Amino acid sequence: VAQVATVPFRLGRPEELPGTLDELRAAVSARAGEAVRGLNRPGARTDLAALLAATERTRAALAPVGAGPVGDDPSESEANRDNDLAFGIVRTRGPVAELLVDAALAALAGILEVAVDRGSDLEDAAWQRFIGGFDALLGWLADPHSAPRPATVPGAGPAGPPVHQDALRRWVRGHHVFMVLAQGCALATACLRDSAARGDLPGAEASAAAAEALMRGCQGALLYAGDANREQYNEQIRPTLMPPVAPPKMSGLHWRDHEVLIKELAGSRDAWEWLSAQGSERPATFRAALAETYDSHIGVCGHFV
């Protein structure tokens, strides 16, 4: 795993994520705002290489917040740990939402490193959706009471000649993006539920806008991982004399960030209907995004056809 992605990939415990807009703003908006400003600095968006350099410069300029590994976590099953280990994930002590900002910037850099060198085979609209998911996450975290504004995403060159195990690199780095987006969407959905419960219609609307933008980013990430997985299957046609090692795979049951996201989404049904009744257009477009993300599990998740 260390030969295919920068690890440890440090992430907080998703069970600790804030659950209200005011709590989220207090926890992360300062640091997210710094991240957004770094990624939108003069020259950062001229081309993909500039965005990569801006991402690494932004990461370096941020105050470190981690306090080392969580270590012994009574809430973490062995199967949770195995799921994390398979992708080089280390659950890290510290402010969970600030660690999410760090993880988002690191996952972005991981994606851009490969794309700057080897291009991408993704359709330009999928590339825009995928990378745009980072702008949605960080822009929303910078000001959770407002919908986030989309930004320019430089295009990726056409895919170059295959290098050994590049598909595995994209597979693993893509899953690092999954974990960031799952936490982000869990945050947005929790804030939607809380705002609706408290009758905060503007807060529900902003949270729903974030949830949909993050859901579209997740769909783009699933397309990116599906492209990597298909290439992986082709590299697997060769029989090997050494024991054949399967690519790492997420469990579903034992992937904590996804479990937290799904539980939030389940409890949000009434908030989505209430937004509809209050004149929002977000429920209908979120429903479309949700359907597309679900269908795009096919060819990525081992528990789908």
175 is in an annotated binding site: no
- 145 marked as part of a ligand binding site: no
- What is the C-alpha separation between 53 and 41, in angstroms, rounded? 11
Known binder of ligand: residue 111? no
- Regarding 299 and contact with ligand HEC (CB under 6 A), the answer is no
Report the alpha-carbon distance of residue 305 to residue 298 in Å, rounded. Answer: 6
The site string for ligand HEC over 129-158 (x = CB under 6 A, - otherwise) reads ------------------------------
Q: Which of residues 228-257 bind ligand HEC (CB under 6 A)?
A: 250-252, 255
CB of 149 to ligand HEC, least distance (A): 22
- Quote the CA–CA distance of 34 and 94 in Å, as a whole number: 18
User: Which residue from 63, 266, 277, 305 is in contact with ligand HEC, where contact means CB under 6 A?
Assistant: 266
Contact status: 218 vs ligand HEC (CB under 6 A): yes
Q: How many residues bind ligand HEC (CB under 6 A)?
A: 24
301 among the known binding-site residues?
yes
Q: Pattern of binders to ligand HEC over 168-187, x per CB under 6 A?
A: ----------x--xx--x--
Q: Which phi-psi region, left, alpha or beta, contains residue 5 (left: φ > 0; alpha: ψ -120 to 50)?
A: beta
Residue among 1, 7, 197, 262 that touches ligand HEC (CB under 6 A)? 262
Question: Residue 88 — left, alpha, or beta (φ > 0 → left; ψ -120 to 50 → alpha)?
Answer: left
Residue 263: CB minimum distance to ligand HEC, A: 9
Give the other-Cβ count within 10 Å of 216's Cβ: 23
Interaction site with ligand HEC (CB under 6 A): 178, 181-182, 185, 218, 221-222, 250-252, 255, 258, 261-262, 265-266, 290, 293-294, 297, 300-303
Q: Which residues are annotated as a binding site for heme?
A: 297-301
